[PDB]
């Protein structure tokens, strides 16, 4: 039977959203049924930061991070990203952690 009150995800009072393509497998998928992870990560990394300023002009420079929004397909979101799977009760909890 019915396994979710939000059905797939988060559509009430619309009837049509518009699809986005999945970053991983390219599968089209509704925007509100997708699963989005903001990717904000520094350009460099853990390691290269010390050797950055060491080889760099300017005091301390700036360090400009890169921001890109990720869109996953379920099946691709399941294969890696936010999934696990949850118990019948633990599913309900929309808390991010």
């Amino acid at each position: 039977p019915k396994k979710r009150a939000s059905n797939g995800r988060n559509k009430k009072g619309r009837g049509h959203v518009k699809p986005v393509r999945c970053v991983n497998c390219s599968k089209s998928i509704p925007k509100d049924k997708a699963i989005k992870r903001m990717a904000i990560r520094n350009i460099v990394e853990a390691a290269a930061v010390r050797d950055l300023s060491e080889a760099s002009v300017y005091p301390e420079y700036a360090l400009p991070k890169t921001y890109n929004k990720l869109h996953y397909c379920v099946s691709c979101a399941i294969h890696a990203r936010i999934v696990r799977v949850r118990s019948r009760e633990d599913r309900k909890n929309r808390a991010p952690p």
Partner: protein, 127 residues
């Protein structure tokens, strides 16, 4: 102090490009991609290959005119992954740790105001 070039590290998957040009961009200074410095074809993008290619590029840069460079890192872009490849990090590391100067580096990845249908079909690439 120094004499400035411009880096432009294009890191996709299955290869990584490091080539410095003149500050106006119209004029080369060397190249040496990440496929060149090894041959498995499956190692084309790996950091160890990207490191070596960063070495050969930093050499010729200081072997002609350029003691310093600004870098623009880049991904495939367009309708594609938009997230950098594995060997853009190893390249930046090994070309600054090579003894060349660094400053004011940004991200030039092409990002559309989205369109031009992505490949792989509505059902997606399924394996």
């Amino acid at each position: 102090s120094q004499v400035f070039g411009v880096a432009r590290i294009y890191a996709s998957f299955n290869d990584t490009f490091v080539h410095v040009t003149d500050l106006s961009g119209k004029e080369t200074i060397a190249r040496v991609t990440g496929g060149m410095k090894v041959k498995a074809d499956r190692d084309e993008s790996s950091p160890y290959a990207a490191m070596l290619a960063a070495q050969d590029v930093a050499a010729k840069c200081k072997e002609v005119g350029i003691t310093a460079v600004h870098v623009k890192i880049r991904a495939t872009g367009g309708t594609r992954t938009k997230t950098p490849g594995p060997g853009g990090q190893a390249a930046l590391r090994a070309l600054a740790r090579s003894g060349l100067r660094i400053g004011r580096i940004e991200d030039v990845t092409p990002v559309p105001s989205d369109s031009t249908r992505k490949k792989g079909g509505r059902r997606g690439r399924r394996l």
